[PDB]
Amino acid sequence: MPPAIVVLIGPPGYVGKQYPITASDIVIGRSVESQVYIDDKSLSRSHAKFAVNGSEVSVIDLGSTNKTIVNGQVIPPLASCLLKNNDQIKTGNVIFKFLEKGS
Numbered sequence: 001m002p003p004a005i006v007v008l009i010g011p012p013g014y015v016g017k018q019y020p021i022t023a024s025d026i027v028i029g030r031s032v033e034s035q036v037y038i039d040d041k042s043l044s045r046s047h048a049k050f051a052v053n054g055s056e057v058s059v060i061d062l063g064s065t066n067k068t069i070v071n072g073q074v075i076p077p078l079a080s081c082l083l084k085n086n087d088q089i090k091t092g093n094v095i096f097k098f099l100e101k102g103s
Contacts, residue, residue: 003057004102005036008088009095014038018102021057026050028091042066042092051080057098058082059089066092 004020019026019036028036031045044064051058061068063077069090070081083089085100 001102004099005089005096006099006102007038007094008097009093010038011040014040014094018099020102021050021052024051024053027062028096038094040092040094043094044092047091048075048089056082064091 002020002022004018006018007014007016009015026035027046027049028034028043029046030037030039030043034046044062044066046062047064048062048068049060051060058080059068059070059075060080061075061077068075070083071087075081083098085098087098089096089098
């Protein structure tokens with residue numbers, strides 16, 4: 001399977017949902033235009049996005065109100081983080097787990 005993110009912590013409609021990360025330009029946000037749409041008021045309308053190049057998947061912060069945090073480190077606006085298996089990504093009151101192979 002391609003890589004994915006899983007909702008570890010979130011609202012009841014969303015906890016445990018998995019989203020495949022197959023290509024660049026996938027956006028996490030509360031705007032309905034987002035590919036990873038979560039209805040949580042603490043998530044920015046456009047919060048973060050992914051870049052994919054072969055086996056490398058990175059997350060990019062888009063100037064979010066409540067920040068993008070990977071394993072306890074803040075990713076400042078327009079900066080990025082190369083992900084690895086089991087990393088946690090906190091976006092407001094939502095926390096995702098990154099899986100190098102999705103279930």
